DNA sequence: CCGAGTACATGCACAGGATGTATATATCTGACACGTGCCTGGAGACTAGGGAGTAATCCCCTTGGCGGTTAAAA
């Protein structure tokens, strides 16, 4: 919230991808639009969010 | 000479990630699907005629039922 009011990015590095997951769950119900990087999804996929 | 301990090696377990799998979906197309009238081979109704098998007896063989003997089953 103190960087909203600056504006510049924000990266999260999580080891677990349940705490990704929740991340997600929880970022979502604020207004908060993102991108998860794992390894789950395709190359295209990565490649089309890169 | 023996015991304590530190160090190196190792093994097992967990988590990540990649690849195989299977179903959900999309779409244009051969083929089911559906009228439109034709008609001619069928499908049935209506008289008349035929006929073979059902039904009842009844005579007559072929079954099913008695006691031993050894031969085969055990």
């Given at each position: 919230?103190?960087?909203?009011?600056?504006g510049?990015?924000?990266?999260?590095?999580?080891?677990?991808?349940?705490?990704?997951?929740?991340?997600?769950?929880?970022?979502?119900?604020?207004?908060?639009?993102?991108?998860?990087?794992?390894?789950?999804?395709?190359?295209?996929?990565?490649?089309?969010?890169?």
């Amino acid at each position: 919230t103190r960087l909203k009011s600056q504006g510049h990015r924000v990266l999260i590095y999580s080891q677990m991808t349940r705490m990704i997951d929740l991340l997600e769950e929880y970022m979502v119900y604020r207004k908060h639009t993102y991108m998860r990087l794992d390894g789950s999804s395709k190359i295209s996929e990565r490649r089309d969010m890169v």
